[PDB]
Design a protein around this motif. Sequence first.
Motif, PDB file in Angstrom:
ATOM      1  N   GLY A   1      41.064  32.356  22.157  1.00 30.72           N
ATOM      2  CA  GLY A   1      40.008  33.103  21.456  1.00 30.72           C
ATOM      3  C   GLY A   1      38.863  33.546  22.364  1.00 30.72           C
ATOM      4  N   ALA A   2      37.611  33.564  21.872  1.00 35.05           N
ATOM      5  CA  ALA A   2      36.560  34.306  22.632  1.00 35.05           C
ATOM      6  C   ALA A   2      36.129  33.591  23.929  1.00 35.05           C
ATOM      7  CB  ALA A   2      35.445  34.753  21.758  1.00 35.05           C
ATOM      8  N   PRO A   3      35.990  32.235  24.013  1.00 34.90           N
ATOM      9  CA  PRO A   3      35.655  31.586  25.269  1.00 34.90           C
ATOM     10  C   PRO A   3      36.707  32.001  26.347  1.00 34.90           C
ATOM     11  CG  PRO A   3      35.296  30.132  23.437  1.00 34.90           C
ATOM     12  CD  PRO A   3      36.074  31.295  22.900  1.00 34.90           C
ATOM     13  N   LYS A   4      38.005  31.956  26.004  1.00 37.75           N
ATOM     14  CA  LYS A   4      39.098  32.189  26.999  1.00 37.75           C
ATOM     15  C   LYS A   4      39.030  33.662  27.472  1.00 37.75           C
ATOM     16  CE  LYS A   4      43.919  31.150  28.047  1.00 37.75           C
ATOM     17  NZ  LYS A   4      44.306  32.506  28.436  1.00 37.75           N
ATOM     18  N   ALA A   5      38.836  34.611  26.563  1.00 38.89           N
ATOM     19  CA  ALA A   5      38.731  36.052  26.885  1.00 38.89           C
ATOM     20  C   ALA A   5      37.498  36.319  27.755  1.00 38.89           C
ATOM     21  CB  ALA A   5      38.758  36.850  25.599  1.00 38.89           C
ATOM     22  N   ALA A   6      36.386  35.680  27.454  1.00 43.48           N
ATOM     23  CA  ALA A   6      35.085  35.908  28.137  1.00 43.48           C
ATOM     24  C   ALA A   6      35.152  35.348  29.560  1.00 43.48           C
ATOM     25  CB  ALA A   6      33.950  35.291  27.359  1.00 43.48           C
ATOM     26  N   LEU A   7      35.653  34.112  29.741  1.00 41.99           N
ATOM     27  CA  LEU A   7      35.831  33.490  31.089  1.00 41.99           C
ATOM     28  C   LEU A   7      36.713  34.439  31.919  1.00 41.99           C
ATOM     29  CD1 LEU A   7      35.623  31.413  33.307  1.00 41.99           C
ATOM     30  CD2 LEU A   7      37.100  29.985  32.102  1.00 41.99           C
ATOM     31  N   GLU A   8      37.878  34.810  31.398  1.00 38.69           N
ATOM     32  CA  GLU A   8      38.824  35.628  32.181  1.00 38.69           C
ATOM     33  C   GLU A   8      38.183  36.981  32.551  1.00 38.69           C
ATOM     34  OE1 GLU A   8      42.416  35.330  29.895  1.00 38.69           O
ATOM     35  OE2 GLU A   8      42.679  33.222  30.545  1.00 38.69           O
ATOM     36  N   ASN A   9      37.375  37.625  31.684  1.00 38.47           N
ATOM     37  CA  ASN A   9      36.806  38.948  31.997  1.00 38.47           C
ATOM     38  C   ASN A   9      35.784  38.774  33.111  1.00 38.47           C
ATOM     39  OD1 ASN A   9      38.335  40.691  30.247  1.00 38.47           O
ATOM     40  ND2 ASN A   9      37.217  39.922  28.493  1.00 38.47           N
ATOM     41  N   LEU A  10      34.982  37.706  33.034  1.00 37.35           N
ATOM     42  CA  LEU A  10      34.034  37.305  34.124  1.00 37.35           C
ATOM     43  C   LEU A  10      34.752  37.157  35.482  1.00 37.35           C
ATOM     44  CD1 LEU A  10      31.406  34.901  33.069  1.00 37.35           C
ATOM     45  CD2 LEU A  10      32.470  34.515  35.380  1.00 37.35           C
ATOM     46  N   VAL A  11      35.848  36.412  35.488  1.00 35.47           N
ATOM     47  CA  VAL A  11      36.687  36.194  36.708  1.00 35.47           C
ATOM     48  C   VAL A  11      37.284  37.541  37.209  1.00 35.47           C
ATOM     49  CG1 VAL A  11      38.629  34.997  37.663  1.00 35.47           C
ATOM     50  CG2 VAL A  11      37.207  33.769  36.029  1.00 35.47           C
ATOM     51  N   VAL A  12      37.767  38.418  36.346  1.00 37.40           N
ATOM     52  CA  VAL A  12      38.277  39.778  36.786  1.00 37.40           C
ATOM     53  C   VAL A  12      37.136  40.503  37.525  1.00 37.40           C
ATOM     54  CG1 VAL A  12      38.997  42.063  35.854  1.00 37.40           C
ATOM     55  CG2 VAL A  12      40.076  39.969  35.040  1.00 37.40           C
ATOM     56  N   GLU A  13      35.939  40.515  36.947  1.00 33.67           N
ATOM     57  CA  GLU A  13      34.751  41.187  37.524  1.00 33.67           C
ATOM     58  C   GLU A  13      34.372  40.503  38.847  1.00 33.67           C
ATOM     59  OE1 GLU A  13      31.089  41.449  35.293  1.00 33.67           O
ATOM     60  OE2 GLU A  13      30.214  42.902  36.718  1.00 33.67           O
ATOM     61  N   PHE A  14      34.329  39.189  38.868  1.00 29.46           N
ATOM     62  CA  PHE A  14      34.030  38.493  40.131  1.00 29.46           C
ATOM     63  C   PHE A  14      35.027  38.916  41.232  1.00 29.46           C
ATOM     64  CE2 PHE A  14      34.786  35.100  43.046  1.00 29.46           C
ATOM     65  CZ  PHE A  14      33.517  34.949  43.585  1.00 29.46           C
ATOM     66  N   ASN A  15      36.308  38.890  40.884  1.00 26.52           N
ATOM     67  CA  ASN A  15      37.420  39.074  41.852  1.00 26.52           C
ATOM     68  C   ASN A  15      37.398  40.515  42.402  1.00 26.52           C
ATOM     69  OD1 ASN A  15      38.257  36.416  41.727  1.00 26.52           O
ATOM     70  ND2 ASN A  15      39.938  36.695  40.381  1.00 26.52           N
ATOM     71  N   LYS A  16      36.989  41.518  41.605  1.00 27.39           N
ATOM     72  CA  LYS A  16      36.950  42.947  42.045  1.00 27.39           C
ATOM     73  C   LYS A  16      35.876  43.114  43.104  1.00 27.39           C
ATOM     74  CE  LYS A  16      38.412  45.362  37.720  1.00 27.39           C
ATOM     75  NZ  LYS A  16      37.958  45.820  36.371  1.00 27.39           N
ATOM     76  N   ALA A  17      34.856  42.291  43.062  1.00 24.78           N
ATOM     77  CA  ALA A  17      33.676  42.416  43.932  1.00 24.78           C
ATOM     78  C   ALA A  17      34.030  41.817  45.291  1.00 24.78           C
ATOM     79  CB  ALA A  17      32.545  41.684  43.256  1.00 24.78           C
ATOM     80  N   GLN A  18      35.052  40.960  45.340  1.00 23.89           N
ATOM     81  CA  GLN A  18      35.313  40.043  46.484  1.00 23.89           C
ATOM     82  C   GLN A  18      36.270  40.722  47.461  1.00 23.89           C
ATOM     83  OE1 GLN A  18      33.923  36.897  47.087  1.00 23.89           O
ATOM     84  NE2 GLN A  18      32.441  37.430  45.495  1.00 23.89           N
ATOM     85  N   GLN A  19      36.294  40.278  48.710  1.00 25.15           N
ATOM     86  CA  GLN A  19      37.144  40.943  49.728  1.00 25.15           C
ATOM     87  C   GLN A  19      38.241  39.949  50.132  1.00 25.15           C
ATOM     88  OE1 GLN A  19      37.122  44.085  50.106  1.00 25.15           O
ATOM     89  NE2 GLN A  19      38.606  44.256  51.780  1.00 25.15           N
ATOM     90  N   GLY A  20      39.346  39.988  49.370  1.00 20.08           N
ATOM     91  CA  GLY A  20      40.473  39.047  49.485  1.00 20.08           C
ATOM     92  C   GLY A  20      40.033  37.602  49.245  1.00 20.08           C
ATOM     93  N   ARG A  21      39.066  37.364  48.354  1.00 21.37           N
ATOM     94  CA  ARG A  21      38.591  35.992  47.984  1.00 21.37           C
ATOM     95  C   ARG A  21      38.448  35.892  46.458  1.00 21.37           C
ATOM     96  NH1 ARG A  21      33.588  35.011  48.856  1.00 21.37           N
ATOM     97  NH2 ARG A  21      33.398  33.143  50.153  1.00 21.37           N
ATOM     98  N   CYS A  22      39.297  35.094  45.809  1.00 23.01           N
ATOM     99  CA  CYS A  22      39.470  35.143  44.343  1.00 23.01           C
ATOM    100  C   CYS A  22      39.307  33.760  43.702  1.00 23.01           C
ATOM    101  CB  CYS A  22      40.777  35.812  43.965  1.00 23.01           C
ATOM    102  SG  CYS A  22      40.704  37.590  44.313  1.00 23.01           S
ATOM    103  N   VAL A  23      38.925  33.777  42.430  1.00 24.33           N
ATOM    104  CA  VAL A  23      39.051  32.582  41.572  1.00 24.33           C
ATOM    105  C   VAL A  23      40.324  32.740  40.749  1.00 24.33           C
ATOM    106  CG1 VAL A  23      38.026  31.356  39.661  1.00 24.33           C
ATOM    107  CG2 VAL A  23      36.635  32.100  41.550  1.00 24.33           C
ATOM    108  N   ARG A  24      41.002  31.640  40.529  1.00 27.37           N
ATOM    109  CA  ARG A  24      42.179  31.634  39.620  1.00 27.37           C
ATOM    110  C   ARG A  24      41.906  30.655  38.506  1.00 27.37           C
ATOM    111  NH1 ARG A  24      46.592  29.487  42.532  1.00 27.37           N
ATOM    112  NH2 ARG A  24      47.036  31.700  43.158  1.00 27.37           N
ATOM    113  N   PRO A  25      41.623  31.129  37.260  1.00 30.34           N
ATOM    114  CA  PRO A  25      41.427  30.209  36.150  1.00 30.34           C
ATOM    115  C   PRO A  25      42.822  29.688  35.775  1.00 30.34           C
ATOM    116  CG  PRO A  25      40.624  32.431  35.603  1.00 30.34           C
ATOM    117  CD  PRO A  25      41.603  32.516  36.782  1.00 30.34           C
TER     118      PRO A  25
END
Length: 396
Positions: free
Chosen positions: A27-51
């Motif tokens: 539900g909404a916590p899981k969708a919100a965390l994952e959208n945050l991580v997609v945004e974080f990961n796009k900003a990064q230069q081959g450095r990612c979080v994996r939930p």
Amino acid sequence: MKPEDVIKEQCARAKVVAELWHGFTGGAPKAALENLVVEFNKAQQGRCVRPVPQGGYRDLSTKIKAAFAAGKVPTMAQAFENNIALYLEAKALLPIESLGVKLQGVNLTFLNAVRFGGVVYGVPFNKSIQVLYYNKDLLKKHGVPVPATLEEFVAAAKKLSRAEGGPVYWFQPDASTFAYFFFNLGGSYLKDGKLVLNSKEAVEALTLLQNGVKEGWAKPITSGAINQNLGSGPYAFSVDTSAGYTAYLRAAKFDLGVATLPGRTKGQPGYGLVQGTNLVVFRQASKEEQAVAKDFLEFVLSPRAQAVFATATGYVPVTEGALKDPVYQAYAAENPDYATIVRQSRYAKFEPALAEWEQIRFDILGQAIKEAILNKADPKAALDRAQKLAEDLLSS
Ligand SMILES: Nc1nc2c(ncn2[C@@H]2O[C@H](COP(=O)(O)O[C@H]3[C@@H](O)[C@H](n4ccc(=O)[nH]c4=O)O[C@@H]3CO)[C@H]3CC(O)(O)C[C@H]32)c(=O)[nH]1
Ligand SMILES: [Cl-]
């Protein structure tokens, strides 16, 4: 293309990947965390979080203990304050300010809770506060004011249950619901440093709920969340986590109310139990994974990340900065329940941060509440039993 699909691709091309183990099952916590991580990961230069979902919060702590045993821990994980205590016995946790993460602006309600012997070991992330959910339409129908006091709340529940022919206060028979009544009848779990489950206020809290069941104004929910049981018979009120807000909004066929919790007097709202989690960083993680966690933790504390996360969920924005973000302000200006959640977060109690508390709140205290509510056990005898099991576990 689910956010988790996007992230798996982002991580497959990353030089460095920091796992974040969580307990959001959907539900909404899981969708919100994952959208945050997609945004974080796009900003990064081959450095990612994996939930990595680990189930719910207790599955997550069990998997984390098996991780120490295996010697394969994540970079980060969600943690309640009691989980942080436990992992500190293991010497497992990196002090946060060692990464140089800036914490000023984080609400001292939450910052104080992650501080152990002066040192911050967690980043408040998804912190929730109990609120009063209500049925505006059913209260209007019987001319019932939103109750401001415990006295008014009992009164309204009896008045509405009489009128509608069934129990209108709905509750999960658990430590979380118990805590609301316990705190606001003047309870405290610690006396002269000792954990006490069977105090006069605990017996008075458990008695109030059991008498509500017997009198026909309290309805125990034993299958699904409260918001998953709506539409089955009359509902006027729950005391539930703010992190359920979006789920309440979606499920309610009636005009959904959010209020601050009934207190002892009108001079103040009642105390809400603080729930949800902190992010911790494990010492076993590589220097490179730690650097990713430091950028991620800075990102999660940013006004925009908190304004987006809090407004998608009903979690309490953890920084003063998040309330000054225009995306927060736009949501707040359109929906007064966001300010209501923040107001209630000013009146906030925690459960004990003892290493053993997760086992106690579920298997000992939680059980004694179920014994009273669902099996008609005498409230004092059920709590005296709890106290004895807790004294025996703490002596172990
Ligand atoms: N392991 C462990 N859990 C603990 C501890 N202290 C408290 N809690 C649990 O935190 C949950 C509150 O955390 P919170 O993030 O506010 O809320 C949860 C969900 O409740 C909420 N949710 C989701 C769907 C839905 O239909 N309704 C809804 O409310 O979404 C969030 C993430 O799933 C309570 C629930 C509990 O598991 O029964 C026991 C409580 C502890 O020390 N350990
Ligand atoms: Cl889902």
